[model samples]
Target: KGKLPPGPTPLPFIGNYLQLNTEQMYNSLMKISERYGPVFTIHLGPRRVVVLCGHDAVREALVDQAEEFSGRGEQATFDWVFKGYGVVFSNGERAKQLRRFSIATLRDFGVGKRGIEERIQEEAGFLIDALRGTGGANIDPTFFLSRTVSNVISSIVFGDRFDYKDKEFLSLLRMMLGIFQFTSTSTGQLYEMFSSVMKHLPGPQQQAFQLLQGLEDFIAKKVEHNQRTLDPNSPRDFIDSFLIRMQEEEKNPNTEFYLKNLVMTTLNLFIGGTETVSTTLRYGFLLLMKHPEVEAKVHEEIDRVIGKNRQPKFEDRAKMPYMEAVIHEIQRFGDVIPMSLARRVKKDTKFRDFFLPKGTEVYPMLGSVLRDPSFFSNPQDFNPQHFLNEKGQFKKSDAFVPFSIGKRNCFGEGLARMELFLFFTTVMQNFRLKSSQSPKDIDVSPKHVGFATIPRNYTMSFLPR
Candidate 1:
């Protein structure tokens, strides 16, 4: 009744907040759309969010009205945390410049380079060695693999590595996990709703804020250390580039490459780069454990192509079609990043008959489209067959967009894809993941940890060939 678009009934300031699930936001949107059709609206406190459920609505809003939907709607907590620094938090020219710089830096720094690929392959081998140390016993491969993947980015960004026993490294990982948790929880939502009050209270948001501050402090320490020893002529790593940029841009008071942005951007890169690829790999194992035949088929394909003797590389992906399809299926079926990072309406836009008012925040329900029955054959079932042809070659599907599409599509997509293919195949080539406990009895369900979906921490035995 507010002259805005149609939505579920509102109760004073808290629109549909009571009806939706904060933890599983996509699942909540699905239920809402099933009941109220696509392109519905929800209000979170004072902010109005338009929900684009399926492909039709999502495409119309995000693609058709691309310009109008390009602006990022930084939520209150987002502003509070990031302060509009870096690519993920900022919009307009700053966001564009940072995104471009990041993509270029990532590509040049290590994305497709053999040096980088070799580094990843080395890490994969290290992971295999770690698993081999387990002596074929039941061991949770998730943390070991996660650390390996995280280290890949660490090496790329910092020119440093941390052994699994390194306390600082483990501390950073713990803080990273805390940041993810605080951002993705109901308490996080409460912070968004009543930020002023929440800021003053003793709650998870405060704890998370402290943790984030601690993270920024850690990043700052790294940056400070890097600056002290950095050679401008030879860029050692991401921090070096960032510090150099910050030095050169000291002339511009408004540059996006400020120290604060540098820290948050590095944090974004660290979290976005690490958790996403690693969690997808973790889910790959979880889904495979549920479907051993599919897992065996994947291993069979890898064996035929790479053989047990040779280590896997990215080039092998072209030949290992079945394995490639298995990876795609894992990404699609898991659909880990189930929602688009929030976008704001640049101007008033219309999708079909609905009016998305200017400044209205919109969320593209990616899970709905990725799991759409129309786009995917059996959306409900975790089937690798969906991404494979009769001849067993890899087939791409539009529904396989774990990285949400549009202007704000993930910048690290290429890195993520390469990491997935390289790391997953490397792991699969070296070891097969088997559940320590019965698959059903030991919860294999996906949990919505903030930023990305992560598999429940459970032990799995690696059967190395």
Candidate 2:
């Protein structure tokens, strides 16, 4: 037995788990890392985790030692929910292969392709029309936008899109929303700690686990249904890809490329890809609504670049610097995907002078990097200029990593980018979003301590220009 890296110790099996329930874990980690330097360690029962908590540490962990930190250390709670079938949850050889396959497949299907942007543009057009049909009433654009965007992913994944009013679709959506609320909060961490006991105990976690199980079972049913009716000639969507892959792996008993992976991967695509981009868009519209000047400037740029009478297209991104920078600022300011899905150290390593031993689980803390003043001129203020040059052209900044970085970065980054551009510009061009009541009436910023950062719910008016 050897001493692990320096950190506050705890007694026996309880570890530091109790301290986390009372205090903010991320903030505490940030403070401790700052005090102890970039790389540090903490113990969770038998597990010793090495946390890399800054830009340099993140860069080294994710970029410099990408191969060394390639394996994901999914928390016990996530495993109990998602299992290890799909790319997000899978590790080792399976993760490596699936991630590679997914990236290549997404590219082929036009993730960053011009045609993909056109599809997003078309979907956004539908969303704008859908919102207009709401009759300027006080409605949370979040639900509508989230559903519409989610349906777009469904179309890509299951080769079908559901009507917003479709009861079946809405039921699935509600289940997902419940799962999101359950997973992306302080309660999630609490459940993660106590879930071993809480699973059988009376509480919301039990309900959440049930909902999660139901969602997976729903996906499994969809996969089975697709297998029955799927056309070999047509080969529709992601499900079709899985069906085809399954056929190829029929002889291999060791293959994870079966119906289970099919369902989970599709679920991951929808769960991981949809909610995130839509939430960012929600925050984007809300933030723009709050800052009319920023909105006006964006509109001005769009008008000059794409002409107000005509709808904007993805091809116009190169010409619209202000619009692009605003999107970056929204993602930067919004900070949706706060957690970078944990990593396991392959071998003993030294980071920021701390000797972290092998099998140490670590996560590249994104909060500190995104907020680093060295990267952004103003970390607290909402400034699109951070991504723009003196000449007002969009410039790529190393700090702008909404997709995280390195080998295990988000597989759907390209899709996210295209969606952001298409959806953001389409919504902005067709309508203006603003709070129904005065800004002082409600909190505009997100509730800071969730699994993914999100704005507090508020109704907004979408004015058709």
Candidate 3:
């Protein structure tokens, strides 16, 4: 047991739950890292979690020893329903098979010459129209942003973009909002700590569970529709492609391609695709509002590179260095999914001065890497200069691991980056953001400490440029 890295001694039932204040959970993680040093172990309920902090420590564990540290760990928030069946939570051959197939399939649809770029470009126009409909009134921008961002992945998965007024579409968005909001609250964070206790409790996480169930049930209906209209020769969307594969292996009694994997995989993509990127978008805009100069420079780049009449394209990212820098900065600063979905040690392995047995829960804290002083000069302040050089060209950092590092990194990284660039540029081209309070007065500190770091709620108007 001494072979394991040192961590705080655990108390019965609670472990280190009360050892650190619940309100500052993320800060406590960082604070604890300073005392025990990086790569320390902590007990969260039944699991002994090995946390890898800082760029060097996280990189050594995840990237240098990729496959060894690639096992999916406890996503306690959703594990009750997911049951290790999908692409996100499952480990070993099953997880790899689903993830590889999904990535290959998604690339065929999203990462081609003018593929999802065209889709995202079209949605930007719809989003602009929605903003125009707001009549410059001060609004939260959360709901509309959620709708627009959700549709980018929704179209690829379901083969159709939802109407702005669609009741079913709107309901799912609200659930995502509710689920994300609940995850970091006092009640939900407890679910993160003691996964057992909250399954029995009533208000928040249970409500989130119901929302997820509703989300899963709706996805099941979409899968049913795809099954009925599936043309093996012509795959329309992600579901169509999956259905064709499922049928090919239907005669086999034991095969990975089945209904359970299908529904869960689709749910994984849909929900996973929705929250993180949408939250990043909201957080990015809040950062821009707080630093108006950065916003204008991005808008100026949009005008110069992408003319007002034309929509922004993914290709334009190369020419717009300032815009590229700003976007990169937003991601580095936002670090939305800070503590990336938990990972586990695949096998018994010696790491640094300690040994991790197989199946030990591991957390590679991305926020630490993103804000590592070794890379960014001003890790605390909102500054695009982190990604810009003296000549003002976009600079890349080895520490910018917002999407995380290694094989278990975000599945939709490419799709999400494309959406962020196109959506941000297109919106900046049409209208300027205006907060109700002065720019300096606006608070950008995040409230949530779990997986997501949601930008605090605020009202802003989209004034016509």
Candidate 4:
């Protein structure tokens, strides 16, 4: 309709799929925005998508009219994996009920509290010990980081942490990591675009689907264990609490508290909570190694503020402005989930002279706002100064929507930020990252475009300070 924002015309079947190259889809989205203005429409495989680019446009839509733009669109790939039953994809009352309950439940378990920080700080020691076991050899930090981060989420959800060397634990982490990797690849993008067709063909998506199934089975087993051992008077973890609630509502047929919801909600927590933070750590270190001066400054701040012998705590973050700045910049520059989780318009409404029909999928491109030249002086470059004022104090920007914005923003934003700060400061305080290649030779550019901006795999030596 002419009422919709203007965009390039789509072709049959393929739509704008052939127009926007999948290799670097974010860049393409930005370029298209340049021509079509901040708000525009495009079709990806016959699905009409309304892309909200830039800080103002995205904010006006997501924040200024929060609830109106709060409903999450069904991610085809995620639907395939989660079956449209979890917090990530479910819409209306179901999503609201689950998300509210999950957040409240997690808070009780210390997600945004000192209890969880203590857990994270303890895990940091374990991670540091594991890195020490590497003996200064150049090692891929992927699994180490993955396990450490997963342990934090595992502690909350399952009421336990795994030994980093536990084969079963490592296997589960690998399966979660595989989903992140596969979903970001070009083939993965194709699968999402043509899932109905791709489902019939064998590919990495199928492999990823199998891994997710295995992960589901793992969660289901935990549910079974928790069910057998559930004590109503004493809730050990999230699963125990959820099981108790399920029993309480068992007599009511209308209750959303059921088996499928349990499995998918647990999956949502694990899948959503693990990879993003770990990948940010991985990418953050790569940036520090690339810019040793940044690392040195962070180290100096850590030493002066927290010191070497003691573990870094959440409180020490306020005193270490430089470290805080670097962490913010890493998230901004890394642009982890560039496009963010998609949203759907809850109703047919008027937005800036455009009529957005209800149920239309929307992408508030976070990368656009994170790297918007209006906010950061060096938008395209990795500079900690983006979050720092001339006095070197940590400055906050409304544009720093790394967790996305509005009612549908990241569910675990507080927990993730705490993890980033504590884990990053703790690691930087103790070790200096080193690589065999020169900093210039090490490319920090992401390797994938779909789903996430996946950092490239590289080996680095962690030298004890």
For model 1, residues 45-86, the per-residue Cα lDDT tens digits are 666788788777777777777888998875555567688887
Clashing pairs in 2: none
> Quick one: best lDDT, which candidate?
4
- Candidate 3 colliding pairs: none
Taken over the whole model, the C-alpha lDDT of each candidate is 0.77, 0.75, 0.86, 0.88
* TM-scores for candidates 1 onward, in order: 0.93, 0.94, 0.97, 0.98
Off by over 4 Å in 2: 1-3, 21-23, 44-47, 440-442
lDDT of 3 by residue, 1-465 (tens): 439889999888788886666555678888899999978888776578999888999999999999989999987778877898989989888898798889988887875448788988889999999999999999988879989999988888899989989998889998888887777666666788877877887767778899989988999999999888888999999998888888898997877789889999999989888888888889888888899988888887888888889888898999999988888888888878778888898999889968899888998999999999998888998898899889989899999998898989986888888888989998999999998888889899986757678778888999989
Query: Could you report the Cα RMSD, in angstroms, for every candidate shown?
Result: 2.3, 2.2, 1.4, 1.2
Candidate scoring better on TM-score of 3 and 4: 4
With candidate 4 superimposed using the best TM-score fit, by how many Å does residue 283's alpha carbon deviate from the native?
Answer: 0.1
Over 4 Å off, model 4: none
Model 3 local distance difference test score: 0.86
**2, model 3: CA deviation in Å?**
7.2
lDDT of 4 by residue, 142-219 (tens): 999999999999998999998876999989888977887777877777775678788778878788889988899999
Error of 2 at 260 (Å): 1.7
Q: Show the lowest summed lDDT stretch of 10 residues, model 2.
A: 16-25
